[PDB]
Amino acid sequence: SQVFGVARIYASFNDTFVHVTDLSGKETIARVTGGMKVKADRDESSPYAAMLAAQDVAAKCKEVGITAVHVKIRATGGTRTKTPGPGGQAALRALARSGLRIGRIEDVTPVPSDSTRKKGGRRGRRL
Amino acid sequence: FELSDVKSSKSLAEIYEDDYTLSEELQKAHSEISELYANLV
Amino acid sequence: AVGKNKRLSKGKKGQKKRVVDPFTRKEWFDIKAPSTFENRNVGKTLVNKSTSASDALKGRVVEVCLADLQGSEDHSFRKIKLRVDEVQGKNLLTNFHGMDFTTDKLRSMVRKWQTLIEANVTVKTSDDYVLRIFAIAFTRKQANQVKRHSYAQSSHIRAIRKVISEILTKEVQGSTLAQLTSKLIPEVINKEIENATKDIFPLQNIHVRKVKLLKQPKFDVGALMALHGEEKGKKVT
Amino acid sequence: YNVGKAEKDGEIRLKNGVAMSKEELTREDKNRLRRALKRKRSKAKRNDVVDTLSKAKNITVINQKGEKKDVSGKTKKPDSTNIKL
Amino acid sequence: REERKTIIGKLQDYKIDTSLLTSSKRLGEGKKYNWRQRVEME
Amino acid sequence: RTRIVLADSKIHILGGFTHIRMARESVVSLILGSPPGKVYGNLRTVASRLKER
Amino acid sequence: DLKTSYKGISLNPIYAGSSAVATVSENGKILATPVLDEINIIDLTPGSRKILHKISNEDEQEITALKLTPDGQYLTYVSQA
Amino acid sequence: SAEKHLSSVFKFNQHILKNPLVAQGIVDKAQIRPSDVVLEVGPGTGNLTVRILEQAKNVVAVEMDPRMAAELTKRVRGTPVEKKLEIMLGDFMKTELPYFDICISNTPYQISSPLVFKLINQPRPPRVSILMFQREFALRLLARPGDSLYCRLSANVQMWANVTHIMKVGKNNFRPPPQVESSVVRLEIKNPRPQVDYNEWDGLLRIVFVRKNRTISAGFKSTTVMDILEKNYKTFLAMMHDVVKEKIDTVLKETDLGDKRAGKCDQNDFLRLLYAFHQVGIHFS
Amino acid sequence: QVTSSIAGNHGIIADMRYVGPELNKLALATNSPSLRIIPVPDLLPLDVEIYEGHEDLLNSLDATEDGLWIATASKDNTAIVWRYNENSCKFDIYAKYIGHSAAVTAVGLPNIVSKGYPEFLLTASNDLTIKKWIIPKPTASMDVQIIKVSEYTRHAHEKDINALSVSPNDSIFATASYDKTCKIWNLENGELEATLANHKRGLWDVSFCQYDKLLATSSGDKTVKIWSLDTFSVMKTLEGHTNAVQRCSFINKQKQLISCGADGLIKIWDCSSGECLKTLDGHNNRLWALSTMNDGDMIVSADADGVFQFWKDCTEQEIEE
RNA sequence: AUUUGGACAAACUUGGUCAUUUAGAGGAACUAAAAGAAGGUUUCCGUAGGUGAACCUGCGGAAGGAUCAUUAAA
Ligand SMILES: [Mg+2]
Ligand SMILES: [Mg+2]
Ligand SMILES: [Mg+2]
Predict the structure, then answer these.
(1) Would you call C25 helix, strand, or coil by DSSP?
(2) What segment(s) does the record annotate as region Disordered (chain A)?
(3) Candidate from E33, E35, E36 with C-beta closest to I213
(4) Which residues contact H176 (CB under 8 A, 6 or more apart)?
(5) Exposed / middle / buried, residue C192 (Cβ in 10 Å: 0-12, 13-18, 19+)
(6) Is H266 labelled as part of a ligand binding site?
(7) CA-CA distance, I222 to I238, in Å (whole number)?
(8) Which DSSP string corresponds to H219-269?
(9) How far is the CA of I236 from the C1' of J19 (A)?
(10) Mutate to test the interface with D, among H95, H96, H118 (most CBs of D within 10 A)
(11) Residue C7 falls within a domain, yes or no?
């Protein structure tokens, strides 16, 4: 009596995606971003915006029939930071409060065995 | 303003705890000065 | 940013009206695992109703934890991909498609002051499934060891790698895909590697890290039915 | 309590306690009240930059558009027929 | 200098407008009209 | 008003969202090579503001 | 002359921003339609259509299901709360 | 109550010279005639502008800081030269400047390059300009063909004017001292202006100064340059990628410049290259 | 058959026109293939007339001043002409025009109808061409006439054409494109009369002054510019909008101009001096549609939320008080 | 297609004649004018560049540049 989806959270430096799908992942149920929930660009990555997105997604899940989700949280990865930020942690807490069973939580950041050059240059970036 | 460069004895919860709840030390000396001035007089 | 202050974009001009809820036209489908796994029910998926439903369902890959499939947390750090091959009366019949570890378990195993030994082989089963195995092992220190580290000489590493490749090739070739899966679950391959490499160098955390399925034979419904262990309709009146 | 300035902008309230609406005053009474205030005021850094600019006449301001305007904010601007006629 | 004057003189024979030419800066990118008044007035 | 764990090349900063972004800029300036004395000066400017608000 | 002063009359949508189905009374006179987190009870009497009531929860939670009794005396609705 | 307008164009948020010899030397080298109207860029407090006001018919001062404009105003109120000064406040690059014979500038170095070409393109341009730039930028105006600092700016500016070094000003002569060295230079725009289209001259220079110390043939090897030139050839016909390749090859071979470096070429070599391209119908811009 | 239909909402409205023999009806070009017509409320209008002739959402809409003709531009690359049938008191599909490669984004009808029917139809499309279609003379068969040949086809712009405006005397028409330029075409030949290139962002609307030789254009640069058609130069630039200006119209003949912005505010300007007289704030979303009646005595604006504001001039009432 | 003549008649040029706004400079009236601080920037080497250059940038290298906490295990 427990139907499972997959809540795929993508916490970037400038935004947060909360994306629920079926177990296969080919089928989308609800995708909401923090930029759909705030009035200023500066706040799209905020923990506040990620909480509104997750509650918006959790309600749609309960309607469709999903009662549980597995969580696959990720950061940008690649040549950039590998750990999901505060926005992603905020969404995961919001889903837990929402009333959906949380099945299994995994970090699936794309980690290169080897990388191309990062965008900064020789002197660095992110002043 | 002086910025402390030593480890804070108060834990991160405490620094928020006290925020939930012109200076006493400045007034503490003021009492001491009055005591010293009164005794000297 | 949905505020009024946000500058108008070109793409806002003409937008389709939301006049149909997509989930009205979706149909749910049950996913069933091969008989090698103890817990056959692995959830359900949905697809647009046939106008066909089968075409979109076939080729669909679902990955699940072995702990769910076996009901034991000893397999919490291993995942199994299952690919839908046949659909019968809302039941999606799946077959082994791959296996992999969680990212946390791998990072847990990789530690400082020891040697990381990894081997891979491309080999085919007796059923003509071409697959690639990845094995990982680490050197360990002895009970009375006093050195801080447990590094192995490159001669040992090549010797251990040669032994592991010999074992991986032997097990896969002399077995079918279903039988190979039955070897992965009890981690019997790893114990075989441990025994063979015992006289070369002590090892720890010997695991078959990953399994890829590179090529597949012609699909045979009869073989799939047997792996899962026809139905007349009911007159409509 | 002490009587102060008029709360409304259309009235004069003195410290004597007497209020005077500008509408009810005759013209002669409005003149002396104007001169009475002048006596009271007579005996009684960016802004300093602004007034110096406004005081001088040979000053032209160029806005972001490149158009030429005076310190006041109005656009700064011989013919034989005009001078002869 | 005398060579400069000759070359400059010969250029005017081959001179054109440049509005349509793509700039080399692009190398990096790689009734009457007012009849309505008339009806209301009458 | 944050706490920082400097585990070899791995930096963890614990605090409120607006605060840990303030801490991150100072750490990034140090990594990019700004001398500690100059960084300590900027910290005083922001620290003064934090008490005001 | 110049046309500066203008007086406006607003026409809001009655039924929008929700998956809930509108309901009508048995006689067909009263129509209740959800608009986001608000409900518009509307009289359908010809020549005198008007908004009888405006119900606003203010909780921001949308209306999931909405039902008006056949006699029209009661309105029952459920929210996401 | 002018705060309304001046606050809408300025927000009311420099290295000041401290050597009178530099200020004096500039004005003497200008050689201002008594019938000359002078544009003065960067009046500062007014140390120089009073000196120009003494010997010039009229002086037009352009300033960017409202405070510095007021300081200029105070230094000339109720004086015989108050009637000869006109202060233009605000960004003077967008505005259309009046006619003037001489330009004496304590330039903000940020606007050095735009200014040098604003004067050159000024209709009826000034006959002499005494401009102060930084050493690195100044030396590129003064660079000769075959020098290391020869570049696009050197070739372009030398086609419309002649630039001559006057003196060097060190960082010590300013307070607070800047981190770069300064230099005072003379610019003389040519009258009559040479009858070469600015777009054609600059257009050719840009393609060939992408790598100044690389052969001219390689400059025309880039695909994007070929695409740009191919379209321009099409435009010429309107009033063929393989064809353009052959046309460029012949011009570079015949002029014997295809194996030369732009850093070691003078005006004539570019002019011969420009003319030869026109004969084959390739107009750069 | 359906006796009557109630409109819960009208979606997002792209354009509006006053239609019908008494001009009491309001035709809407929403994000729906159907042409909606609603009655102008007395100053709740639940009723709506839904006409279905198109296959995809309607980009734009135009109508003749009598109100008996409507032209609808659709995203299915076709344009329909509708005629009012007094017998049934409803509009009927009169003609269809099929020859465009991409969506038809703007459409235009004559401002002078002397034969009793409009004689041409101007259309613009995302294929970046403008076509002049002739409208057939009415025929008793009352069967839809499908036309696939246009009087001329001219390549107009490099980016999508956003608006099309027709002059009072049907001598010229203007197209506004998101390539930052407005072009004026001779209506009889399609020859490019002029190009008005001064804005810094792409243009959203263009409006001829129906009385004097003036043109107003609105851009994403938050400004409106008034152009002299004799000299083809900017006479005024109107600033004050916080966001992009999507609609602009002349009211009170030459005197005033009304504009709508993505910020949701409607401003009334004085064309002679170019300063904002009044700001109307009744909307909480962008305004794609703005229609006026009786030279700006009545103004209708439609929000993206689906809210109509009906503004009525009341100056003389205020002045008397 | 094209031609003659007869009315209708758009649109153009012109001097007038009417009505409406409207630019500078004068002349001469009336009314109004109740306020009162400080605050961005490691030092270089080789090489290559620079047209909003009081300095910027690409590549490789150096310290002649300020090491806290946890940490053997069980
Ligand atoms: Mg940042
Ligand atoms: Mg260097
Ligand atoms: Mg070395």
Answers:
(1) coil
(2) 107-127
(3) E33
(4) H15
(5) middle
(6) no
(7) 9
(8) HTT-HHHHHHHHHHHHHHHH--HHHHHHHHHHHHHHHT-TTSBGGG--HHH
(9) 27
(10) H95
(11) no
**Cβ contact, residue pair I46, G42, below 8 Å:** yes
The annotation status of H28 as a binding-site residue, yes or no, is no
Nearest to I243 among C7, C15, C17 (CB): C7
Burial track H147-169 (b if 16+ CB lie within 10 A, e otherwise): eebbbbbbbbbbbbbebeebeeb
- As given in the structure block, the two tokens for residue G70 are 């056949």
Residue C17 lies in a domain: no
Cross-strand partners of C113: none
Resolution in A: 2.7
Alpha-carbon distances, residue C107 vs C77, C110, G27 (angstroms): 12, 5, 69
DSSP H helices, chain I, are 315-320
**Helix (H), strand (E) at residue H117:** helix H112-121
Distance between CA atoms of residues H110 and H64, nearest Å: 13
- The reply to whether residue F20 touches residue A86, judged by beta carbons under 8 angstroms, is yes
Pairwise CA distance, residues C50 & C48, whole Å: 6
DSSP per-residue codes, C26-62: EEEEEEE--TTSS--EEEEEEEEPP--HHHHHTT-EE
Domain count, chain C: 1
Q: Which residues contact D14 (CB under 8 A, 6 or more apart)?
A: D3, D20
The Cα H267–Cα G56 span in angstroms is: 80
Which residues constitute the domain of residue A40? 1-127
**Using omega within 30 degrees of 0 as the cis cutoff, is the peptide bond preceding H176 cis?**
yes
Residue A123 with chain F: CB contacts under 8 Å:
32
Nearest-angstrom CA–CA distance, I84 and I71? 12
C13 within domain boundaries: no
H106 labelled ligand-binding: yes
> What's the CA gap between D78 and D76, in Å, rounded?
16
Residue F45: Cβ-neighbour burial (10 angstroms; 0-12, 13-18, 19+): exposed
Place of tokens 């008005």: I196
Q: How far G45 CA sits from the closest chain A CA (Å)?
A: 35
The answer to whether A38 and A49 are in contact (CB under 8 A) is yes
Contact A11, A85 (CB under 8 A): yes
N-to-C CA span, chain D: 68
For the four alpha carbons of H97, H100, H102 and H104, in that order, the dihedral sign comes to negative
C208, β-bridge pairs: C135
In 3D space, the residue among I279, I255, I257 whose CA is nearest the CA of residue I267 turns out to be I279
Residue C195 and residue C199: Cα distance in Å, rounded? 8
Q: Which two tokens stand for residue H15?
A: 């290295």
Whether C91 is in a domain gets the answer: yes
Amino acid F52 reads: E
CB within 8 Å: I243 and C5: yes
Give the domain CATH number at A85: 3.30.420.80
Phi and psi at H118, nearest 5°, equal: -65, -45
- Give the number of domains in chain A: 1
Closest protein CA to C1' of nucleotide J10, residue: E31
Q: Which chain G residue is nearest to residue A98, measuring alpha carbons?
A: G81
A80 CA → J41 C1’, Å: 26
> What is the Cα–Cα distance from A25 to A17, expressed in whole angstroms?
15
Residue whose CA is minimally distant from J54 C1': H178
Q: CA nearest I259: which of I233, I234, I284, I277?
A: I277
Cis link prior to H192 (omega < 30° from 0)?
Answer: yes
Cα-flanking dihedrals φ and ψ of residue A110, to 5°?
-75, 110
- Let me know how long chain G is: 81
Give A92→chain G minimum CA distance, Å.
20
Please state the length of chain A.
127
Residue C40 belongs to domain spanning: 24-229
- The three-state secondary structure class of H115 is helix
CB contact at 8 A, G11 and I319: no
Provide the edge-to-edge strand list for the sheet that holds I90-97: I58-63, I69-74, I79-85, I90-97, I145-147
